[PDB]
Copies of this chain bind each other. A is one copy, B any other.
């Protein structure tokens, strides 16, 4: 199984993508053992990016690696089609789309047609990005089978029964969990990995949990998983999407600029309180020789 980072998008003070800081971030992640980078996901504020900015993001990361899954979805299908087609020039793993978000009670037929339209035009394998909380609708294993053209799925529902059902109804499909808290479990139960937001800032930990579980050292894996869980929990106190910037600087030593408002940066008191919550975890991780001091 794999650890895939849904890579953060760093913005400048001028609310433009900071390509320099992004390439630095990407190259650290690859050097620390991340298998692939998922570009323009939730964690990368994808829905906050214009079609042109989704492409800009791909180009900056592609300078670093071609191990990219390129998220192109949106509420203007023509733009999503144009991004799928433009990805022909890039030798990447695949493209991806969440379900059309916002609109409630969309018909299954219209959801199916949306995804099939993207497969029709795609020059690469197509991955399902299933984020039911964010989009308001689930594309479960049966609808995924009906759509019939997904090479893989990232399932962000917190219920591994749901995630396992993709593999049961679609045995050739690659199946990942979007949970940071299930890295140990996914690796130990036969699924293909995790698209883990927390690997932005502790890629060392996410990869080590996975290695330990693969080696059937389930107890060590779980004790490290539980330390990772505490960081995730601390990241949610002030909003995880904003907190992920602060944590990546704290743990990895470089900065990722700003988020895009209304994903607002943490203020200096929140930054201090957050670091307070993870100070001790860092020291334990250095002690354990997972982080350089």
Contact = CB atoms under 8 A, between A and B. Distances in A.
A134 B42 contact: no
Interface of A: 15, 42, 45, 47-48, 50, 75-78, 100-107, 109-111, 113-114, 117, 133-136, 158-162, 164-165, 167-168, 179, 181-182, 184-185, 188-190, 216, 218-219, 221-222, 225-226, 229, 236, 238-242, 260-264
A168 B101 CA distance: 32
Contact of A264 (B113, B158, B241): B113
Given A103-B42, A134-B103, A188 B239 contact: no
Nearest to A261: B77
Contacts of A238: 107, 109
B160 A185 contact: yes
A182 B191 CA distance: 13
Number of copies of this kind of chain in the complex = 4
Give chain A's interface secondary structure class.
helix
A226 B263 CA distance: 36
Contacts of A135: 102
A106 to B, nearest CB: 6
B179 A106 contact: no
A62 to B, nearest CB: 24
16 contacts: A47-B102, A76-B261, A77-B262, A105-B240, A106-B263, A110-B239, A110-B262, A113-B262, A113-B264, A161-B182, A164-B225, A184-B190, A185-B185, A189-B189, A190-B221, A216-B216
A285 to B, nearest CB: 17
A222 B136 contact: no
A111 B185 CA distance: 31
Given A134-B104, A168-B229, A260 B76 contact: yes
Contacts of A261: 76-78, 114, 117
Contacts of A162: 158
A218 B188 contact: yes
Nearest to A180: B161
A216 B189 CA distance: 9
Which residue, of A158, A159, A185, has the highest number of chain B Cβ atoms within 10 A? A185
